[model samples]
Target: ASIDKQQIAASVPQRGFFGHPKGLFTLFFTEFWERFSYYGMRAILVYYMYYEVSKGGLGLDEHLALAIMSIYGALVYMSGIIGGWLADRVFGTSRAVFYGGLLIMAGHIALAIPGGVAALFVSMALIVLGTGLLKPNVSSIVGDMYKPGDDRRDAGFSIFYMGINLGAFLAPLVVGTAGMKYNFHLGFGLAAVGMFLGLVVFVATRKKNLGLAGTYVPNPLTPAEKKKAAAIMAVGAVVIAVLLAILIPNGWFTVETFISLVGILGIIIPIIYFVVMYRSPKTTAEERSRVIAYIPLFVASAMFWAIQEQGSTILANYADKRTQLDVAGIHLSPAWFQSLNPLFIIILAPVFAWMWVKLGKRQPTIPQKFALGLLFAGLSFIVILVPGHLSGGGLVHPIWLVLSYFIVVLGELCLSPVGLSATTKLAPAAFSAQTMSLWFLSNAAAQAINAQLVRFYTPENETAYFGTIGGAALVLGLILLAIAPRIGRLMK
Candidate 1:
C-alpha cells in the first residue's frame, strides 16, 4: 500500500476500511495492536503484584496493589498532557506514536525479565510515558481523517473503536490464562510481542496508508520558544527525580502518599488546564466559550470513567470472590470478566454507528448524549445493589456481573465515543491534541480519586460503596441534562 504521498493525499474518502476512508485501516490496525498489548499486560499485572511468590507474583498487599493500579492509571493520563504538548509543538502525532510504541515495547520486555521492584518501576515509567504519548494522539489522528462538518466522524470513531475492542476482548483470555496457568513473565513477553507487531506494521504501512494525516505540528515552537521549553522541561525532570531520590530513601513517600498526591493531581491538573486554556489570549473567543461548554462534559466524563475503570479493580475482585465461576458447567477466569466491556462494545458498536448516521441532523447534541450517558452509568452501578442484597454471602449468579458490564458498556458507547468526537469538535484549532489530553484526564482524575475509593469496596461496605457512586452519577446526570441545552448553544 506504499503509494506516493501526493496520490494518497488526493484520494479523499476512499472507503478502504469497511466503507470508511483507507487511512482508517492503518489507524484502527495500529490501535488494535496497542490495545492488545495494553489490555494483555493489565489482565495479569494486578494478579502478578498481589499473588504469592509461589503463584508467580510479587506478593504485595492486595489492597495496596489495587491502589497502585489506580495510581498507575492516574499517572498514565497525567503524562498525556505533556505528550499532547510535545506533539503540537515538536514531533507531531506520527513521530510520537513511533516513539511511544518503542518505549512501550521496551517496558513490557523489562517486565518479561525475571527482575524485581526496580524492574517494575522502570517498566512503569517507560510504559506510562509511552502510553500517554500514543493513546490520545492515535484518536486525534482518527479525527484528522475526517473533514470538519462530516457526520461520518461519529461512525468513523465507532468503527475505529470496534477494531480496538476486538484486541482488548481477546487479550485477557490469552494473556491472563498464560499468567494464571504458567508464568507471569511469559505473559508479559507475550504482551511485548503485540507491541513489536504493531510497531512493525505502523512503520511499514503508515507512509502509504496515512498520507498527510497526523503528519504536521499544528503549532510548532519558534527557535526561541524551543530553548525556553527545553530548560523548563529539563528542570522539571530533574526536580521530579530529586523528589523521588530524596523521599524514597527516607521512607517519606509511602503508598498512601503516592495515592494521595496522584489523586489531587488528577483533579487539580485538569482544573488548572481548564482555567489556563479558557483564559489564554491565544485561544479564540469561540474556542474559549467551547472550553466553558467542555467543562461540564469533561466533569461528566470523569464521573463515567471513575465507575467504568472499576472493571479492573473492584469488578475484577468481585468477579473472583462474589460470583460463581461456572456458567453452564464451564469454568471462567476472573480476568475473563474484564473482557466483557470490550466484547459488548464489539457486538453493538456498529449498531451505534448506524444509529448516528441514520439520525444525523436529529442526532442528540453532544452534552445531551453525555448527560443521558451518565444516567445509564449511574444505573449500572446502582444495579449492583440487587446482587449484593440477594447473594446472602455466597457467590451469586454471574449474570448479575454480566448485566453490570452490559449497562456500563451502554454508557461507554454514549460517552467515550461521543467524548472523543466532542473534544475534536469543541477544541481550539492550535490546541486540539491538548484538548484530547484533557479528555483522557477524566479517566485519570477518575482513577486518581478512585485510588482512594478502591479501599472502600469490602463485602461489609459493598452496598454503601456502590450506592454512593451510583447516586452521585444520577445527580450529575440530572444536573447535566438541565444545562445541556445551554451547553449546546455554546457549541453553535
Candidate 2:
C-alpha cells in the first residue's frame, strides 16, 4: 500500500522520551550540536577576516569580508535543493546525514589550521555542502517520526526547533567569547568538536532509537540514471576545478569577481526557476495563476531577508566598529550580539503562535502578513537612523543595535512562517517538491543584493546607508499592503 513511508508504525519507538518518539531524543541533540558548530564558526568569521594581521586576522579589507559572508550565505541556500535531491535519489536520508556531519566537521577542522584565505574558502565550500545535505534532510527525518495526523508531531518539532535556537543562542557566548579572548583557530577547533560530538551521538544510537526512519530512499535512481548522473557530475567537477585553476592566478579573477558571478546567478537562478515552473507542461492553468501570485510574495520575502540577513554583515560590523560595547562597567564581545536573534525567537515564537491561533478566523492573510513583515523590517532600520542622526559621529549605545535586531525578528515572525508554508500552497505541481529551495531563494536573492549593499556601509555614511535601504522596505510594504486584497483574490 505504501512506497516510501519507512514503515514508521513498526520502526519508530513510541517510548516516552519527553513524551515523544525515541527518535526525538536522537534528533534533538544532533541538531543542537550541529547548529552549535555552525553558528559558533559564523560568530567569529567576520572579525577573523577584517581585523589586522597583527591582531591575529587575515588582514582582509573590511567591506570585502562582509560581501563574502553574504555570498557564502547565499550559496548555502542555493545548495539546499541539490543536496535534498541527492538524498532522495542517490542515497537515503540517513546516509546523507552522516556524510554531511563528516563534511561539516572536516570544514571546521580546516579552519582550525591557519592556512589563510585558501583555508577559509576550503572551509566555506565544505560547510556549505555539508549543511545543504544535513539541514533539510534531518528535518525530513523528523517529519517521518509520526504519522500524518499525530497530535505530538508539532510539539516534537517545536522541541526540535527549540534545539536549533538553543544552540544558536549559546554559540557566541561560548565560542565567540573564546575566539575574542584567546585565538581564532581555537574557536574553530571548538566548532569542530561540537560537530564531532553530534556525529558520535547520531551514529551511536540512530539504529537502536529508530529502526528504519531515514533509511528508505524516496526516489531511488535507476541504474542507468545513476551512471548518467555520475558521469555528468564528474565532468562538472573537472570543469570547475579547471576553471578555478585558470581563474585564481589571473588579476581579473579576484574575490570580488567571484562575488559578482554568484550575485548574477543568485538573481538569475530564481528567475529561471520561477519562469520554468510557471510555464511547465506539468502545471495546470490554475497552478499557473498561483505561480503568478507567488512572484510579488517572493519579492517581498527578498526585501525582508535583505534587511534580516544583514544581522551578520552590516549589523555585526556596526556592533564592532561603531557601537559602545562596554556598558555600565561590563564589557561585551561584539559577537555576543549574534545571540539576541535566537533568544527573541525562542521566547516570542510561542507568543506569536498563540496570537495567531487566538485570532484564528480573523487573522491576517498571508499577503498581509508579508506586508506587516516588511513594515517592521523597514522600521528596524529607521529606528537606527534616528539614533545615528542624533549621535552625530559618536559611538551609539548598544541598545540601538539590540532594538534593530528585535524589530526585525518581529517582522520575521509575521512573514517567514507564512512565507515558508505558503510556497508549498502556491508552487506549481511540477516543482511542488522543491518548495524549500524556492522559499530559501528569497533569502539567497536578498543576500545577492547584499553583495552590493555592503560596500556602501561605513561609519561615516551611517544615516544615508540605513535611510535609503530602510526607505525602500517601507515603500514596498505600503504597496504590498494596498494590494493584499487583490493578491488574495488571485490566490483563490
Query: What TM-score, over all chains together, does every model reach?
Result: 0.84, 0.95
Give the alpha-carbon lDDT of every model: 0.83, 0.88
Q: Residues 1-492, candidate 1, lDDT per residue (tens digit)?
A: 123434434544556877778778878888888899899898888878888877788888778878888788778776776787788788888888989999999999999999876787799899999987998688867776676666688998988877677888999999888766778999999999989988998898777777677777767888899999999989999998999999999988876887888888777888898888888878899888888888889899999988889888888878877888877877887778879998888788779889999999999788988988899889988987787687567788888889999999888888887787777777777777466565677787889988888778788888999989999999999999999987887773
What is the Cα-based lDDT of residue 25 in candidate 1? 80
lDDT of model number 1: 0.83
User: Tens digits of per-residue lDDT for model 2 on 33-75?
Assistant: 9999999999999999999988888889999999988887887
Q: Per-residue lDDT for 258 in model 1?
A: 75
Off by over 4 Å in 2: 1-8, 147-149, 238-250
Runs in model 1 deviating more than 4 A are 1-28, 87-93, 138-161, 203-223, 241-250, 277-294, 353-364, 420-433
Local error of candidate 2 at residue 333 (angstroms):
0.5
Best by TM-score: 2
Q: How far is candidate 1 from the true structure (C-alpha RMSD, Å)?
A: 4.3
Per-residue lDDT, model 2, residue 383, is: 91
